[model samples]
Target: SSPGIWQLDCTHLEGKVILVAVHVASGYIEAEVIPAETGQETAYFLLKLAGRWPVKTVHTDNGSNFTSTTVKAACWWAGIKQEDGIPYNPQSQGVIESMNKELKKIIGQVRDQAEHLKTAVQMAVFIHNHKRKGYSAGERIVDIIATDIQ
Candidate 1:
């Protein structure tokens, strides 16, 4: 799967590097900022998160970063099954795919005049996790996570 670029604006800032990961079943999201583009670093970051969350499966598009052996190894080490979405079928990863668009929209609306993008993206993520409704269930995403934890 490929790593796609997601533009974000936070706190009146623009053009920040934000990495997002979503759980397909729960619609839970985890996001963070990275310094720059490095495939190994990406693998490490994802691996670290997986270690914490214990993902059983992961899905992504045919992005070079996602398809890389490093990422695959990382997933393997974490005991997570990795699958790539079918070509042209973006909906295969419906939860994350839709959430990405929504996040972009949120950033656009909130960061229209922000000078920095990173902060705006961070805020957007916070809002998304706390407030956004799920696609099918109409339940708040955080609520789902809370239920799972319980």
Candidate 2:
């Protein structure tokens, strides 16, 4: 069931907000820069990504955007369950924490060459998903997603 869950969270940098979702087991990542932090924005992002990523449950923090009525309604209609982490506890969402670390590092490395934050994020996401690791790790996250899409 771990692979069925998508860990969702947001990170703010210099007043800009970036929403990211990672498929827990496959290491696939999807992210976007939102204009503001709100339930409506979160709901829109969730539904859009769910259309492509297989998501049975969404795991996020106790943020208003993740718990808002709009998000609940979207999950209801989409037949997706929602789970929240303990208040102020990052450990509850460790999957996303590690992902954010790698993501931020990649963004930092590419920021100077990219046109802006959005481009940097996109480039970072690409690098994160395509980069392979360990023994017998030729297949990338995109390869996994292509097989998982059903």
Candidate 3:
């Protein structure tokens, strides 16, 4: 996953709401800008993208937003196992942590200033998923997933 920081404040603008979800294995990301931040909203958004593909497990930091009962129940209903990493241990969710750092760096460059939040996030996500090369094999991670999705 490419390290990119997406500003949540950007979604507050009168346009699309961008919720960024990353597929660790294939580095495929689905970004949606939605209106609310409720568990049902998130579940519906994820389920739409997931389709028939079974979600065996979901790992995330122990944020109250993710640890809410609504989110857990939704995952249960969907037959997905939820794993929350220990607080303060970056290794507990190393992939996402690393990806966040990389993403922030890219976003930083694109902004070239502090307040170009939305533009930075848009370009950062686009370049990271579609243009950047993978560390292991110089292949586009999103391209690999596109093939799998087909």
Candidate 4:
């Protein structure tokens, strides 16, 4: 089934940030532990996410970390399309916007207490993906028939 990148935006956490790409339909998500400095890094990880799932289009904010040439090159090479939110209004990408707030709240509470911010984010993603949407993201991945979630 085709998938959408809920958001590839970075969130402030643990004196730095964390990144993520979400599968809108199933709530399947993967977090990028290491901080990224360039669009190439983001693109590279997005390609990796594609490797994990059937990614067709990635919807993101109008951030330089997503629009650089390296990112475009990777998207073209990987056959993934890119779409952006309004220049200043990130809320237009509603799913990511809503989820981002939740994630930030989650990470903020645990970032300081966990083994590492990286693991904290990963754990959060695991829980978020598997909290039972259409039988949870894990179950959804296992099921033979997939359908977009409302």
Q: lDDT (CA) for every model shown? A: 0.57, 0.75, 0.54, 0.68
- Report the Cα lDDT for residue 105, model 4: 74
Candidate 4 versus truth, CA RMSD in Å, comes to 4.0
Pick by lDDT: which candidate is best? 2
Model 2 per-residue lDDT tens digits across residues 1-150? 554677777887647889988776666778998767788888888888778756789876456855599999888877789887453555545756777888889899999996779999999888876776651112544455556674
Candidate 3 residue-wise lDDT, 3-98, digit = tens: 221111113333435466665455655555566566766666556544644455665433664667776776677776666544365553565656
What is the model-wide C-alpha lDDT for candidate 3? 0.54
State residue 130's C-alpha deviation in candidate 2, in Å: 0.8
**Residue pairs in steric clash, candidate 4?**
none
Ranking by TM-score: 2, 4, 1, 3
Residue 89 Cα positional deviation in candidate 1, in Å, after optimal superposition = 7.2
Worst 10 residues of 4 by lDDT: 141-150
* Off by more than 4 A, model 1: 1-17, 33-38, 87-90, 93-97, 112-115, 132-150
Greater TM-score among 2 and 4 belongs to: 2
Winner of 3 and 4 under lDDT: 4
TM-score of each: 0.63, 0.80, 0.53, 0.75
Q: List the residue pairs that clash in candidate 2.
A: none
* lDDT tens readout by residue for model 1, 1-150: 112111111111234456776654544456666665456765776687666654666654346666788878877887767665544555645645567788878877778556677676767766766673425322443445556566
Ranked by lDDT, top first: 2, 4, 1, 3
